[PDB]
Short mmCIF file of C-alpha atoms and ligand atoms in Angstrom, two decimals:
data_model
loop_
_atom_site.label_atom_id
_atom_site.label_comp_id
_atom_site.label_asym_id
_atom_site.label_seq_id
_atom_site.Cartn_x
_atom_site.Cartn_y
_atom_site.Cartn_z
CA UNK A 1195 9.97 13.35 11.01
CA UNK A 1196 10.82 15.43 7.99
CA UNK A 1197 11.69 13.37 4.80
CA UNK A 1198 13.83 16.62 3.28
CA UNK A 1199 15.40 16.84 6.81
CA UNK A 1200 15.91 13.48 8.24
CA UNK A 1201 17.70 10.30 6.72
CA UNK A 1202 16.09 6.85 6.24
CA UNK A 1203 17.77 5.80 9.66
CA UNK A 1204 15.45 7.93 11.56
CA UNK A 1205 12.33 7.62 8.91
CA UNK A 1206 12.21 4.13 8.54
CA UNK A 1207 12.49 0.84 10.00
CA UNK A 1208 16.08 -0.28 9.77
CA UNK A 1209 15.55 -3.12 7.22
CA UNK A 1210 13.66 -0.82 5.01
CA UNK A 1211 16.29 2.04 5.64
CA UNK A 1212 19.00 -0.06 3.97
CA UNK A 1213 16.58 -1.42 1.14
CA UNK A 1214 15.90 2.37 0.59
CA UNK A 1215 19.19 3.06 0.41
CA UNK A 1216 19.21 3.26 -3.72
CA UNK A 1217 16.43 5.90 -3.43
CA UNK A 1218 17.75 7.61 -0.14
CA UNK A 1219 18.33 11.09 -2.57
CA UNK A 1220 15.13 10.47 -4.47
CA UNK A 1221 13.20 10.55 -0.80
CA UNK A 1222 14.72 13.73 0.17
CA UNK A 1223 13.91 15.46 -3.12
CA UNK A 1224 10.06 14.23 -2.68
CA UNK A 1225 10.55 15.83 0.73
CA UNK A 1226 11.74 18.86 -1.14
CA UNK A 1227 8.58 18.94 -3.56
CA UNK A 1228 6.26 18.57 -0.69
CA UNK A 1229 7.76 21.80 0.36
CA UNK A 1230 7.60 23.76 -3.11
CA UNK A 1231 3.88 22.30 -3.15
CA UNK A 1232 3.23 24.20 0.25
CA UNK A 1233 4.91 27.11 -0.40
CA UNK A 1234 2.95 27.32 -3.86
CA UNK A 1235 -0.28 27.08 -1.74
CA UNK A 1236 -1.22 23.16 -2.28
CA UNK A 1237 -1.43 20.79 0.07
CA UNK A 1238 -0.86 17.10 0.24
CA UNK A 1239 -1.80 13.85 1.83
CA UNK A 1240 -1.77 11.72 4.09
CA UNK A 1241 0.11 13.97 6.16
CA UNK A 1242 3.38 14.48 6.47
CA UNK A 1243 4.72 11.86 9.49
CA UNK A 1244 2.57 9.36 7.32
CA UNK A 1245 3.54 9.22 4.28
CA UNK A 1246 6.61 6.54 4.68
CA UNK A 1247 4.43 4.93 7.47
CA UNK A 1248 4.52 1.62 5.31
CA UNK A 1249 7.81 1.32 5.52
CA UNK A 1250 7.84 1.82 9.28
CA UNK A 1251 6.46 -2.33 9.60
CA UNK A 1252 9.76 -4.68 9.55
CA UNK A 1253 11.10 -4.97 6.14
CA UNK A 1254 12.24 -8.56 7.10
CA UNK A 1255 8.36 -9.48 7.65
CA UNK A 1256 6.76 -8.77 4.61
CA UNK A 1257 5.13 -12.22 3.62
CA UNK A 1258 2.84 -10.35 1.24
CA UNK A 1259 2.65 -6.55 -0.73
CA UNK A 1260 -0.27 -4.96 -1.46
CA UNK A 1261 0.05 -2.14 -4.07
CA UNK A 1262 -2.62 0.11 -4.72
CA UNK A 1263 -2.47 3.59 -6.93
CA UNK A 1264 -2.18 6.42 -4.66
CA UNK A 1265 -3.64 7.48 -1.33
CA UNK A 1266 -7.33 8.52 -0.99
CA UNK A 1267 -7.58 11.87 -2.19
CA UNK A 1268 -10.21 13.13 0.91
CA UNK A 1269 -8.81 14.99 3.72
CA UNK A 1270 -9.34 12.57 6.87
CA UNK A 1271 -9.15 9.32 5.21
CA UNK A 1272 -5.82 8.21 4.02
CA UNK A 1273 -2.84 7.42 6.71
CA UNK A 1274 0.00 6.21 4.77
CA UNK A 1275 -1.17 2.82 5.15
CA UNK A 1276 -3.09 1.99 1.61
CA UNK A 1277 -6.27 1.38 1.63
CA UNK A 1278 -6.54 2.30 5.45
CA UNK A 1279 -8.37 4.26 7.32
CA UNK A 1280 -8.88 5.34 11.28
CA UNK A 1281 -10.52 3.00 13.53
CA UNK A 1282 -12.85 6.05 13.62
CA UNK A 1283 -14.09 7.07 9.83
CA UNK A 1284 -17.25 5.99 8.94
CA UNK A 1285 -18.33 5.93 6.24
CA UNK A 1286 -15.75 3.96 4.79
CA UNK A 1287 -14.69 4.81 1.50
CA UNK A 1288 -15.84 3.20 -1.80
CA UNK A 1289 -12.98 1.20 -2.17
CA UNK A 1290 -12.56 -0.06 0.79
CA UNK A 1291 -15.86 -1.01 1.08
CA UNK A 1292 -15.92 -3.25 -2.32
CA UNK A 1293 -12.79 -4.83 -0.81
CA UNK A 1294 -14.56 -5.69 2.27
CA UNK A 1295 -17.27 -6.78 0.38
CA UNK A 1296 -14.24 -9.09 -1.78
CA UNK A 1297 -13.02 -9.99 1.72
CA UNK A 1298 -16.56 -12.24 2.85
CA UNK A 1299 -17.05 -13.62 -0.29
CA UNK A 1300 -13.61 -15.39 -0.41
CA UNK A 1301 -13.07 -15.88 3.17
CA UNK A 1302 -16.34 -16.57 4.38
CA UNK A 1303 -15.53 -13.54 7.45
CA UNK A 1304 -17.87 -11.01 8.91
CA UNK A 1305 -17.57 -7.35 7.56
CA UNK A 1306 -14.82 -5.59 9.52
CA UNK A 1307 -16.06 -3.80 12.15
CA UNK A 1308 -13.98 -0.67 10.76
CA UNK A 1309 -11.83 0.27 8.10
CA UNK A 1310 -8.30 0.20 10.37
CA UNK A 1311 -5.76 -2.41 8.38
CA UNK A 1312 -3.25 -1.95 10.79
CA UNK A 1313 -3.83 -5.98 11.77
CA UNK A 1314 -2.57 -6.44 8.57
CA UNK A 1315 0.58 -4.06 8.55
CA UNK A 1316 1.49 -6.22 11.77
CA UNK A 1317 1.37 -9.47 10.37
CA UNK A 1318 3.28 -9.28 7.54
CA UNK A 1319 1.16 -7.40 4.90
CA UNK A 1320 2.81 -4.06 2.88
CA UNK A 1321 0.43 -1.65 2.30
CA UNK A 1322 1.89 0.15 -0.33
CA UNK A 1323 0.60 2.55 -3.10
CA UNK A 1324 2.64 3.24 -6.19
CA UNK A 1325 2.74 7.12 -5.48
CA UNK A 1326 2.94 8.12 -1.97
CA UNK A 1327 1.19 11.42 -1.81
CA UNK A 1328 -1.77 13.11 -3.37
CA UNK A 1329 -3.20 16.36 -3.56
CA UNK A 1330 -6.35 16.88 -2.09
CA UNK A 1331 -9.55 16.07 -4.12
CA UNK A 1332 -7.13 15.19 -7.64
CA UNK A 1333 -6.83 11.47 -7.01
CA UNK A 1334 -2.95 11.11 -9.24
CA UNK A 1335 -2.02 14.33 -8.71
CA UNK A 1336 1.26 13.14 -7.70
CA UNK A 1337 1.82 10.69 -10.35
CA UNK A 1338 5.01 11.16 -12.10
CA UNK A 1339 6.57 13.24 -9.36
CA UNK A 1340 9.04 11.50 -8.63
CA UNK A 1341 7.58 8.44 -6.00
CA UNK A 1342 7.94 5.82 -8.72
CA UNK A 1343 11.54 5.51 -8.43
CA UNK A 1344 11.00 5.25 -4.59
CA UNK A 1345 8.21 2.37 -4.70
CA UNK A 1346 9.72 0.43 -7.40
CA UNK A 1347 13.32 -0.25 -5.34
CA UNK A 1348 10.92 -1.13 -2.55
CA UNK A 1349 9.69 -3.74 -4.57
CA UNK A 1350 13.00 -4.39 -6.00
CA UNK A 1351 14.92 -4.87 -2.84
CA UNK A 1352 11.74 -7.08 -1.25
CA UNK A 1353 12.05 -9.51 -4.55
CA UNK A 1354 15.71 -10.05 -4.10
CA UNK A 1355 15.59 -10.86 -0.51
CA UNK A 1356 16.01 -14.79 0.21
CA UNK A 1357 12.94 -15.65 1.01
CA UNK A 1358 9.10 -15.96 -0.90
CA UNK A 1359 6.62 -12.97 -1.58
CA UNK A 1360 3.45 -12.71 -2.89
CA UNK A 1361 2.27 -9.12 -4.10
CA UNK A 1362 -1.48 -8.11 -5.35
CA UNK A 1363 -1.23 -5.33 -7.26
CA UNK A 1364 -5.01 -3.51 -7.65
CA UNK A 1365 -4.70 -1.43 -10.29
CA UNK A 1366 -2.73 -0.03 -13.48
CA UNK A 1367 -0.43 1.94 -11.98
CA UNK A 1368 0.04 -1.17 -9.43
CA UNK A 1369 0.59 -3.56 -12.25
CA UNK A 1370 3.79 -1.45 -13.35
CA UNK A 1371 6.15 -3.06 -10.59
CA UNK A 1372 4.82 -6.66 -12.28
CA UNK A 1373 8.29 -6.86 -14.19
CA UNK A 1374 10.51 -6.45 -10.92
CA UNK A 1375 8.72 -9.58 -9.31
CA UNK A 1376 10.02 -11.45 -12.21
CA UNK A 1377 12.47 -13.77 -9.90
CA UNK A 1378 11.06 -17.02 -9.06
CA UNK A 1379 10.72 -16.77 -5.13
CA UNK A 1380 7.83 -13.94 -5.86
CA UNK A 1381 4.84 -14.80 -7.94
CA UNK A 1382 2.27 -11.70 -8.73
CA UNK A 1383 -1.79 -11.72 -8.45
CA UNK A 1384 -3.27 -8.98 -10.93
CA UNK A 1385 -6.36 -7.56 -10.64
CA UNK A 1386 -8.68 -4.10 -11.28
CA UNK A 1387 -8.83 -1.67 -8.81
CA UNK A 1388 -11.61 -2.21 -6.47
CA UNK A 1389 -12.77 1.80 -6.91
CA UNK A 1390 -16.09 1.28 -7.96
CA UNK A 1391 -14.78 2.92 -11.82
CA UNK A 1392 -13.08 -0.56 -12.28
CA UNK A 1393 -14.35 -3.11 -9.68
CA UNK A 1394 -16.41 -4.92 -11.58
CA UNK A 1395 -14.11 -5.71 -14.24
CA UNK A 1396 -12.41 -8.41 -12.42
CA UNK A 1397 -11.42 -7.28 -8.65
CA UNK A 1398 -14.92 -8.74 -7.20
CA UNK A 1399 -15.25 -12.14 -7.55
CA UNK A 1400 -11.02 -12.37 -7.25
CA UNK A 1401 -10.57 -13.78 -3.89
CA UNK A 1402 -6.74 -12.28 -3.69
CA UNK A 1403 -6.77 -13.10 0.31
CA UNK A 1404 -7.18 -17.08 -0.35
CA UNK A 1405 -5.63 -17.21 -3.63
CA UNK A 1406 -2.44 -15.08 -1.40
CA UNK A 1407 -2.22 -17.92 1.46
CA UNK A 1408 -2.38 -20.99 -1.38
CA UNK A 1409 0.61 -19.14 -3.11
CA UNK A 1410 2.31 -18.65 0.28
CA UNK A 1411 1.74 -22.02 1.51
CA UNK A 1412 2.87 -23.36 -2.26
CA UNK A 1413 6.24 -21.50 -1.45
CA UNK A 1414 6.53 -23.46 2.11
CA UNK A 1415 5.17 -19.56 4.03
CA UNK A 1416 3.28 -19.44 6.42
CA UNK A 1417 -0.44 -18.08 5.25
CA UNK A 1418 -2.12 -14.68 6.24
CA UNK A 1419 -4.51 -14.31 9.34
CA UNK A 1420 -6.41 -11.99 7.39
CA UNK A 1421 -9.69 -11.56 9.92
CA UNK A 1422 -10.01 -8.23 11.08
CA UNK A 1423 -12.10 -7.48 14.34
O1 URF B 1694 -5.32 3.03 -4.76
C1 URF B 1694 -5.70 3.43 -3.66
N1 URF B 1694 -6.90 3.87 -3.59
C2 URF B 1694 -7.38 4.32 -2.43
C3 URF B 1694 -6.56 4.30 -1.34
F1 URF B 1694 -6.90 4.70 -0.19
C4 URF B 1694 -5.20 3.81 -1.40
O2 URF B 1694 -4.42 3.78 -0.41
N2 URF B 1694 -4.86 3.39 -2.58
CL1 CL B 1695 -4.70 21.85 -2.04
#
């Protein structure tokens, strides 16, 4: 359970454990600042049995990465999926609402019923953030703690597997894994972050989901099912 306690081998799925493997050290000192945070009276989310839960989704599936910045900064919404949220939470948050509104316009879909992108996590889709963790309320609070080093060999060790990927990254601190997709079985689709401080300078109107599947397709993948319920 316990990222300071407990190796990749029991955190993670066992592709991702041995991608990890560069970075095993580096997640058991994150594990150990998640403990000096507590201990120095701050807290942290999602929470703790969440925060690897990207990585829990085989490491040999990924057909597509989603990066985002860090997780939602609310108590209640984030779940170490990005973007995510329960089947439950209503309202949605901001961003997740502009990228459902993103999601009709390219691909034509209903609106979600809710906000859960676990559909996605099971059919190939990483929902990753750059940082992992967050303090409450102080959206990249935890940038430059130490989770770059972590999400960057994820990327790293995803790019140099034999097979295509296609990653969105939403966001600056997304866009800084752009130079470890660099090999030519990956190809990168850059965009704003759909918060509403940045969505209208280019993440509406980017249609990532179909522009995703031509990419995939253009590498001889198989496309997304991106419909949610
Ligand atoms: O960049 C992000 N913003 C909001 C989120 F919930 C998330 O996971 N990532
Ligand atoms: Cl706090």
């Amino acid at each position: 359970a316990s990222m300071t306690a407990r190796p990749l081998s029991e955190l993670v799925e066992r592709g991702w454990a041995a991608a990890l493997e560069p970075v095993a050290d580096q997640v058991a000192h994150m594990g150990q600042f998640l403990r000096a945070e507590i201990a120095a009276g701050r807290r942290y989310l999602p929470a703790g049995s969440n925060v690897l839960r990207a990585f829990t989704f085989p490491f040999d599936n990924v057909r597509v990465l989603i990066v985002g910045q860090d997780p939602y900064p609310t108590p209640g919404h984030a779940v170490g999926l990005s973007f995510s949220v329960a089947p439950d939470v209503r309202p949605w948050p901001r961003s997740l609402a502009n990228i459902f509104d993103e999601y009709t316009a390219d691909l034509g879909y209903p609106l979600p019923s809710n906000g859960d992108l676990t559909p996605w996590a099971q059919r190939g889709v990483l929902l990753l953030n750059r940082v992992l963790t967050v303090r409450p309320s102080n959206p990249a609070s935890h940038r430059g703690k130490g989770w770059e080093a972590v999400t960057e060999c994820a990327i790293r060790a995803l790019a140099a597997r034999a097979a295509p990927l296609v990653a969105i990254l939403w966001g600056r601190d997304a866009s800084t894994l752009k130079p470890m997709l660099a090999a030519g079985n990956c190809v990168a689709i850059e965009s704003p972050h759909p918060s509403p401080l940045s969505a209208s300078r280019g993440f509406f109107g980017s249609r990532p989901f179909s522009r995703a599947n031509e990419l995939l397709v253009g590498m001889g993948a198989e496309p997304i099912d991106w419909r949610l319920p």
